[PDB]
Short mmCIF file of C-alpha atoms in Angstrom, two decimals:
data_model
loop_
_atom_site.label_atom_id
_atom_site.label_comp_id
_atom_site.label_asym_id
_atom_site.label_seq_id
_atom_site.Cartn_x
_atom_site.Cartn_y
_atom_site.Cartn_z
CA UNK A 1 47.82 19.83 104.92
CA UNK A 2 50.01 19.40 108.01
CA UNK A 3 48.83 16.78 110.53
CA UNK A 4 49.43 16.73 114.30
CA UNK A 5 48.82 13.80 116.65
CA UNK A 6 48.95 13.92 120.45
CA UNK A 7 51.09 11.29 122.16
CA UNK A 8 48.68 11.37 125.12
CA UNK A 9 45.87 10.27 122.78
CA UNK A 10 47.99 7.42 121.37
CA UNK A 11 49.16 9.40 118.37
CA UNK A 12 52.85 8.53 118.46
CA UNK A 13 54.12 7.42 115.02
CA UNK A 14 57.82 6.55 114.70
CA UNK A 15 57.86 7.62 111.06
CA UNK A 16 56.69 11.18 111.78
CA UNK A 17 58.49 14.13 113.31
CA UNK A 18 58.48 13.84 117.10
CA UNK A 19 58.38 16.71 119.62
CA UNK A 20 57.18 16.68 123.26
CA UNK A 21 53.62 15.36 123.17
CA UNK A 22 53.31 15.53 119.34
CA UNK A 23 53.94 13.45 116.24
CA UNK A 24 53.58 15.56 113.13
CA UNK A 25 53.96 15.44 109.38
CA UNK A 26 55.83 18.76 109.60
CA UNK A 27 58.65 20.14 111.75
CA UNK A 28 57.61 23.70 112.68
CA UNK A 29 60.08 26.11 114.33
CA UNK A 30 57.87 27.49 117.11
CA UNK A 31 60.57 29.84 118.47
CA UNK A 32 59.52 32.55 116.03
CA UNK A 33 55.97 33.18 117.28
CA UNK A 34 55.07 35.98 119.64
CA UNK A 35 51.29 35.28 119.48
CA UNK A 36 49.07 32.26 118.79
CA UNK A 37 45.37 31.67 118.42
CA UNK A 38 43.16 28.83 119.68
CA UNK A 39 39.53 28.81 118.48
CA UNK A 40 38.28 32.42 118.69
CA UNK A 41 41.00 33.72 121.05
CA UNK A 42 44.49 35.18 120.61
CA UNK A 43 47.20 34.65 123.24
CA UNK A 44 50.65 36.16 123.85
CA UNK A 45 53.79 34.05 124.17
CA UNK A 46 55.59 34.63 127.48
CA UNK A 47 58.90 36.39 127.09
CA UNK A 48 61.99 34.82 128.72
CA UNK A 49 60.26 31.94 130.54
CA UNK A 50 59.59 28.50 129.12
CA UNK A 51 58.05 25.13 129.85
CA UNK A 52 60.06 21.91 130.11
CA UNK A 53 57.81 19.35 128.39
CA UNK A 54 58.42 15.70 127.66
CA UNK A 55 56.85 12.54 126.47
CA UNK A 56 58.01 8.97 126.80
CA UNK A 57 57.01 6.67 123.96
CA UNK A 58 58.49 3.28 123.01
CA UNK A 59 61.39 3.48 125.54
CA UNK A 60 62.28 6.86 124.00
CA UNK A 61 62.33 10.11 125.99
CA UNK A 62 61.70 13.39 124.10
CA UNK A 63 62.08 16.53 126.23
CA UNK A 64 62.62 20.18 125.50
CA UNK A 65 62.16 23.76 126.65
CA UNK A 66 59.13 25.08 124.74
CA UNK A 67 57.60 28.55 124.39
CA UNK A 68 54.42 28.97 126.34
CA UNK A 69 51.47 31.32 126.09
CA UNK A 70 49.16 32.66 128.79
CA UNK A 71 45.51 31.61 128.63
CA UNK A 72 43.03 31.74 131.48
CA UNK A 73 40.59 29.43 129.68
CA UNK A 74 40.82 25.65 129.93
CA UNK A 75 42.14 24.15 126.67
CA UNK A 76 42.11 20.41 125.91
CA UNK A 77 44.83 18.17 124.56
CA UNK A 78 44.62 18.11 120.76
CA UNK A 79 42.97 21.52 120.35
CA UNK A 80 44.56 23.10 117.26
CA UNK A 81 46.90 26.06 117.72
CA UNK A 82 47.07 28.55 114.84
CA UNK A 83 49.30 31.39 113.76
CA UNK A 84 47.92 34.86 112.89
CA UNK A 85 47.05 33.87 109.33
CA UNK A 86 44.96 30.91 110.46
CA UNK A 87 47.51 28.19 109.56
CA UNK A 88 47.68 25.35 112.09
CA UNK A 89 51.13 25.22 113.69
CA UNK A 90 50.72 22.87 116.70
CA UNK A 91 48.16 21.32 119.07
CA UNK A 92 47.58 21.79 122.80
CA UNK A 93 49.78 19.38 124.74
CA UNK A 94 50.82 20.56 128.21
CA UNK A 95 49.69 23.12 130.76
CA UNK A 96 51.03 24.77 133.90
CA UNK A 97 48.19 26.74 135.55
CA UNK A 98 47.34 29.46 132.99
CA UNK A 99 50.38 28.68 130.78
CA UNK A 100 50.20 26.37 127.75
CA UNK A 101 53.16 24.89 125.88
CA UNK A 102 53.64 25.49 122.14
CA UNK A 103 55.25 22.24 120.94
CA UNK A 104 57.43 21.98 117.86
CA UNK A 105 61.10 22.71 117.23
CA UNK A 106 61.81 24.68 120.39
CA UNK A 107 64.78 25.54 122.58
CA UNK A 108 67.27 23.36 124.49
CA UNK A 109 66.38 19.67 124.38
CA UNK A 110 67.17 16.24 125.77
CA UNK A 111 66.51 12.94 123.96
CA UNK A 112 67.23 9.62 125.64
CA UNK A 113 67.01 5.91 125.05
CA UNK A 114 65.37 4.68 128.29
CA UNK A 115 66.84 1.16 128.19
CA UNK A 116 68.52 0.48 131.51
CA UNK A 117 68.20 4.05 132.87
CA UNK A 118 65.47 6.06 134.56
CA UNK A 119 64.65 9.74 134.34
CA UNK A 120 63.19 12.00 137.05
CA UNK A 121 61.90 15.58 137.01
CA UNK A 122 62.23 18.17 139.77
CA UNK A 123 61.22 21.74 140.42
CA UNK A 124 64.49 23.42 141.48
CA UNK A 125 63.91 25.86 144.32
CA UNK A 126 65.34 29.33 143.77
CA UNK A 127 68.62 29.57 145.66
CA UNK A 128 69.07 25.81 145.93
CA UNK A 129 72.08 23.98 144.59
CA UNK A 130 72.10 20.51 142.99
CA UNK A 131 74.36 17.53 143.42
CA UNK A 132 73.57 14.32 141.60
CA UNK A 133 70.05 13.26 142.52
CA UNK A 134 69.34 15.88 145.22
CA UNK A 135 68.76 19.57 145.69
CA UNK A 136 69.24 21.48 148.92
CA UNK A 137 70.63 24.77 150.14
CA UNK A 138 74.13 25.73 149.03
CA UNK A 139 75.83 24.72 152.31
CA UNK A 140 74.30 21.22 152.42
CA UNK A 141 75.09 20.55 148.78
CA UNK A 142 78.67 21.76 149.20
CA UNK A 143 79.17 19.20 151.98
CA UNK A 144 77.41 16.54 149.90
CA UNK A 145 79.77 17.16 146.97
CA UNK A 146 82.84 16.81 149.21
CA UNK A 147 81.50 13.48 150.51
CA UNK A 148 80.93 12.10 146.99
CA UNK A 149 84.09 13.48 145.38
CA UNK A 150 86.04 10.47 146.63
CA UNK A 151 83.81 7.88 144.93
CA UNK A 152 85.00 6.33 141.67
CA UNK A 153 82.55 6.98 138.80
CA UNK A 154 80.46 4.10 137.62
CA UNK A 155 78.07 3.83 134.69
CA UNK A 156 75.09 6.18 134.51
CA UNK A 157 71.83 4.67 135.75
CA UNK A 158 69.52 7.72 136.18
CA UNK A 159 69.00 11.22 134.81
CA UNK A 160 67.59 14.07 136.88
CA UNK A 161 65.98 17.08 135.26
CA UNK A 162 66.07 20.25 137.39
CA UNK A 163 63.70 22.98 136.21
CA UNK A 164 64.31 26.32 137.89
CA UNK A 165 63.03 29.87 137.58
CA UNK A 166 66.39 31.12 136.29
CA UNK A 167 68.27 27.98 135.14
CA UNK A 168 67.55 24.43 134.00
CA UNK A 169 70.02 21.60 134.52
CA UNK A 170 70.21 17.86 133.90
CA UNK A 171 72.44 15.58 135.94
CA UNK A 172 73.27 11.93 135.49
CA UNK A 173 74.24 9.64 138.37
CA UNK A 174 75.69 6.19 138.87
CA UNK A 175 74.40 3.57 141.32
CA UNK A 176 76.18 5.25 144.28
CA UNK A 177 74.64 8.62 143.46
CA UNK A 178 77.87 10.12 142.15
CA UNK A 179 77.32 12.86 139.59
CA UNK A 180 78.68 11.68 136.24
CA UNK A 181 77.46 14.43 133.95
CA UNK A 182 75.78 17.80 134.10
CA UNK A 183 74.29 19.95 131.35
CA UNK A 184 73.13 23.51 132.00
CA UNK A 185 70.48 25.37 129.94
CA UNK A 186 70.61 29.09 130.71
CA UNK A 187 66.83 29.68 130.69
CA UNK A 188 64.17 29.75 133.40
CA UNK A 189 61.16 27.48 133.12
CA UNK A 190 58.25 25.64 134.75
CA UNK A 191 57.16 21.98 134.60
CA UNK A 192 53.69 20.90 133.47
CA UNK A 193 51.09 20.06 136.06
CA UNK A 194 49.39 16.77 134.99
CA UNK B 1 90.85 38.67 141.74
CA UNK B 2 93.12 35.90 140.40
CA UNK B 3 92.92 34.12 137.02
CA UNK B 4 95.07 31.10 136.06
CA UNK B 5 95.26 29.30 132.69
CA UNK B 6 94.70 25.53 132.59
CA UNK B 7 96.95 25.42 129.49
CA UNK B 8 99.78 26.92 131.56
CA UNK B 9 99.35 24.40 134.39
CA UNK B 10 97.13 26.75 136.40
CA UNK B 11 94.27 24.41 137.33
CA UNK B 12 93.45 24.52 141.06
CA UNK B 13 90.67 22.18 142.22
CA UNK B 14 89.69 24.57 145.05
CA UNK B 15 89.05 27.56 142.74
CA UNK B 16 86.19 28.30 140.36
CA UNK B 17 86.73 26.43 137.10
CA UNK B 18 85.63 27.52 133.63
CA UNK B 19 86.91 26.49 130.16
CA UNK B 20 90.65 27.14 130.30
CA UNK B 21 90.52 29.11 133.62
CA UNK B 22 90.75 28.65 137.37
CA UNK B 23 89.76 31.82 139.24
CA UNK B 24 89.13 33.21 142.70
CA UNK B 25 85.90 34.75 141.32
CA UNK B 26 82.94 33.54 139.23
CA UNK B 27 82.19 36.34 136.73
CA UNK B 28 79.04 36.19 134.65
CA UNK B 29 80.53 37.13 131.30
CA UNK B 30 77.19 37.05 129.50
CA UNK B 31 76.60 40.66 130.50
CA UNK B 32 79.54 42.35 128.70
CA UNK B 33 79.19 43.96 125.31
CA UNK B 34 82.69 45.51 125.27
CA UNK B 35 85.96 44.28 126.75
CA UNK B 36 89.41 45.78 126.80
CA UNK B 37 92.76 44.06 126.30
CA UNK B 38 95.77 46.23 127.15
CA UNK B 39 94.55 49.62 126.04
CA UNK B 40 92.19 48.61 123.26
CA UNK B 41 88.42 48.06 123.37
CA UNK B 42 86.76 45.26 121.45
CA UNK B 43 83.13 44.45 120.76
CA UNK B 44 81.55 41.17 121.80
CA UNK B 45 80.01 39.36 118.82
CA UNK B 46 76.22 39.21 118.90
CA UNK B 47 74.42 35.87 118.50
CA UNK B 48 77.50 33.72 117.79
CA UNK B 49 79.63 31.99 120.38
CA UNK B 50 82.68 29.77 120.89
CA UNK B 51 82.47 26.25 122.34
CA UNK B 52 85.51 26.10 124.62
CA UNK B 53 86.65 23.25 126.83
CA UNK B 54 89.41 22.04 129.05
CA UNK B 55 90.03 18.61 130.43
CA UNK B 56 91.84 18.48 133.73
CA UNK B 57 92.14 15.50 136.07
CA UNK B 58 89.59 13.17 134.42
CA UNK B 59 87.09 16.06 134.38
CA UNK B 60 85.73 17.76 131.23
CA UNK B 61 84.54 21.37 131.41
CA UNK B 62 82.89 22.74 128.28
CA UNK B 63 80.67 25.70 127.53
CA UNK B 64 79.44 28.19 124.95
CA UNK B 65 81.30 31.43 125.63
CA UNK B 66 80.92 34.98 124.30
CA UNK B 67 83.69 36.06 121.97
CA UNK B 68 85.15 39.33 120.71
CA UNK B 69 86.81 40.26 117.44
CA UNK B 70 90.38 41.58 117.55
CA UNK B 71 92.75 41.76 114.60
CA UNK B 72 95.83 41.88 116.81
CA UNK B 73 97.39 38.69 118.12
CA UNK B 74 96.62 38.15 121.83
CA UNK B 75 98.39 35.50 123.96
CA UNK B 76 97.06 33.03 126.51
CA UNK B 77 97.03 34.58 129.94
CA UNK B 78 96.82 38.21 128.82
CA UNK B 79 94.30 40.03 131.08
CA UNK B 80 90.85 40.95 129.73
CA UNK B 81 89.25 43.96 131.43
CA UNK B 82 85.81 45.54 131.51
CA UNK B 83 85.39 49.23 130.60
CA UNK B 84 86.03 50.26 134.20
CA UNK B 85 89.50 48.67 134.14
CA UNK B 86 88.66 45.68 136.35
CA UNK B 87 90.14 42.40 135.19
CA UNK B 88 87.30 40.00 134.40
CA UNK B 89 89.06 37.13 132.59
CA UNK B 90 92.20 36.12 130.65
CA UNK B 91 92.80 35.22 127.02
CA UNK B 92 92.22 31.48 126.61
CA UNK B 93 91.02 30.33 123.16
CA UNK B 94 90.97 31.82 119.69
CA UNK B 95 89.28 31.15 116.33
CA UNK B 96 91.07 33.30 113.70
CA UNK B 97 90.39 36.84 114.98
CA UNK B 98 87.69 35.82 117.49
CA UNK B 99 88.73 35.44 121.14
CA UNK B 100 86.71 33.65 123.82
CA UNK B 101 85.69 35.45 127.01
CA UNK B 102 85.79 32.72 129.64
CA UNK B 103 83.75 32.72 132.86
CA UNK B 104 80.13 31.85 133.56
CA UNK B 105 78.73 31.69 130.04
CA UNK B 106 75.89 30.00 128.21
CA UNK B 107 74.97 26.31 127.76
CA UNK B 108 77.53 23.99 129.31
CA UNK B 109 78.57 20.36 129.65
CA UNK B 110 80.55 18.91 132.58
CA UNK B 111 81.68 15.28 132.50
CA UNK B 112 83.60 12.65 134.43
CA UNK B 113 85.83 11.16 131.72
CA UNK B 114 86.63 7.85 133.43
CA UNK B 115 85.81 5.12 130.94
CA UNK B 116 84.54 7.37 128.14
CA UNK B 117 86.03 9.59 125.46
CA UNK B 118 84.84 12.89 124.06
CA UNK B 119 85.32 14.17 120.50
CA UNK B 120 84.64 17.52 118.90
CA UNK B 121 83.38 18.17 115.38
CA UNK B 122 82.54 21.10 113.16
CA UNK B 123 78.96 20.53 112.01
CA UNK B 124 78.72 21.51 108.33
CA UNK B 125 75.85 23.83 107.48
CA UNK B 126 72.80 21.87 106.41
CA UNK B 127 74.13 18.53 107.71
CA UNK B 128 72.30 16.33 110.17
CA UNK B 129 73.77 14.18 112.96
CA UNK B 130 73.26 10.61 114.11
CA UNK B 131 75.41 9.20 116.88
CA UNK B 132 79.06 9.64 115.97
CA UNK B 133 78.54 10.87 112.39
CA UNK B 134 77.28 13.86 110.44
CA UNK B 135 76.08 13.72 106.82
CA UNK B 136 73.37 15.13 104.62
CA UNK B 137 69.77 14.70 105.77
CA UNK B 138 68.85 11.72 103.62
CA UNK B 139 72.02 9.78 104.47
CA UNK B 140 71.52 10.40 108.19
CA UNK B 141 67.92 9.25 107.88
CA UNK B 142 69.18 5.97 106.39
CA UNK B 143 71.90 5.75 109.05
CA UNK B 144 69.30 6.05 111.80
CA UNK B 145 67.16 3.35 110.19
CA UNK B 146 70.13 0.98 110.08
CA UNK B 147 71.15 1.70 113.65
CA UNK B 148 67.61 1.58 115.00
CA UNK B 149 67.70 -2.23 114.99
CA UNK B 150 70.78 -2.59 117.23
CA UNK B 151 70.16 -3.00 120.96
CA UNK B 152 71.51 -0.10 123.04
CA UNK B 153 74.62 -0.63 125.12
CA UNK B 154 76.41 1.54 127.69
CA UNK B 155 77.71 4.97 126.73
CA UNK B 156 81.36 4.88 125.73
CA UNK B 157 81.87 8.20 123.88
CA UNK B 158 80.44 11.69 123.63
CA UNK B 159 80.47 13.64 120.36
CA UNK B 160 80.19 17.44 120.37
CA UNK B 161 78.78 18.98 117.16
CA UNK B 162 79.42 22.73 116.77
CA UNK B 163 77.38 24.32 113.98
CA UNK B 164 76.60 27.79 112.61
CA UNK B 165 73.03 27.81 114.02
CA UNK B 166 72.92 24.85 116.44
CA UNK B 167 75.21 22.88 118.75
CA UNK B 168 74.51 19.29 119.75
CA UNK B 169 76.07 16.62 121.95
CA UNK B 170 75.42 12.93 121.38
CA UNK B 171 76.44 9.94 123.46
CA UNK B 172 76.98 6.60 121.74
CA UNK B 173 77.60 2.99 122.65
CA UNK B 174 80.33 0.77 121.25
CA UNK B 175 78.47 0.34 117.93
CA UNK B 176 77.94 4.03 117.51
CA UNK B 177 74.26 3.72 118.41
CA UNK B 178 72.90 7.02 119.75
CA UNK B 179 72.01 6.68 123.46
CA UNK B 180 71.43 10.35 124.31
CA UNK B 181 71.33 13.73 122.59
CA UNK B 182 71.28 17.31 123.90
CA UNK B 183 70.68 20.35 121.70
CA UNK B 184 71.82 23.93 122.44
CA UNK B 185 70.00 26.41 120.18
CA UNK B 186 72.93 28.71 119.50
CA UNK B 187 75.41 28.99 116.64
CA UNK B 188 79.12 28.76 117.41
CA UNK B 189 82.66 28.00 116.31
CA UNK B 190 85.34 25.76 117.81
CA UNK B 191 88.79 27.08 118.80
CA UNK B 192 91.66 26.59 116.41
CA UNK B 193 94.63 25.19 118.48
#
C-alpha cells in the first residue's frame, strides 16, 4: 500500500518521491480529481484557483501550484485524503482559511538548491506590478525599472515568489536588486496561512 | 497598431516585446480560437503549444504560445487577423504546418543573458531530465545519484526541455549539477528554423 509522510512531522525521506509537504512511496497525479474525501466528508476541488505550497528540507526547496478543496472543518496535518473509491491519494499538508491543498504531482512548480541563495514569498496585490524584490503600483514600478535598467547584472542571490489572484510569478535578483530572471505561471492562487 | 519582427531587425526597447515581436499593443492571444491570414481562417490547436523565443540585446524572451494549423506557406511578418479583421499579430515561428500566434501567451521565461547561456531541447516522450541531460528514467535516476555528491556552484547555463505533455527549464552549474528547475504543465513543440 502507498505510504505518505508529512515533512512538517519530520517525514522527509530523500529516497521517496517528494512534493510540497509530502514524501511518498508513490507519485500521484492530483490534477485529475474534482472531489476528495477526508474521514466521513466529501469536498469539491476549487476550479481555476490554486494554492502555492512549498517545503524546505535539507537545503532543498520544493514548491508548486496545487489543487485545493473547500472545507469548513479544521483538518490536521497528516490526515489521509481519499478518492471516491476509498483509495488514499494524499495527506493534509497546507491550509488557507477554508481551503486545503491536495499535494502530489500538481501544476507549475519550482525546485531550488538553497545553497548561497534565499527565497521569499509574497501575496501580489491585484493591480500591482513587480520589479525584482518589490511590488507596487504600475507607475512606481515603471520608474523603478528605469532606475535599475542601467545596472550590470550580477549573480542571483535571492528568489521572490509572487502569488496573485490572476497570475503567479517568480523573480530572481542580484545583490543590487536587479532583476535577473522572471518566470510567469498563468494561474491565480493563494499562499498558505501557517 | 504596429507589429515588428525581431528576426527582421524590428526590436524596439520602448515597445511591448513578445517572442519574435515588438508591438505598440499587448494583445492577450490566449483568447482566440480562430485567426485569419490574408483571406483564410485557421483554427487554433487545442491543448498543444509552441515554445517560442527571441534573444535581443543580452535579453531572452521565451513563452508558450498558441498555434494554428495551416497547410499553406506563410512568411515572417505576414499579418495575422482576428475574425473582425483587426490585426492582432504577425507570423513569427513555424513547426511544419503549425504557426505560432505571438503576444501575451502562457507560461514564460525572461532572462538576462550576461554570463550565462541558454539551450533548447526536444524532450523525448517518456524521458526524464536531470540538469543538462535527458535520458530514460533509470539512467536519469543514476545520473542524479552521481551528481548529488557534487557541491553546487553558480548557475552558468539554462536548459529548456520541450515535451509532448510537459515543458521544463533547468539551470546548471559548471559541472552540470542542477541548481534550479521550473515545470510548465503543458505539451508543446519547438520551432523549426
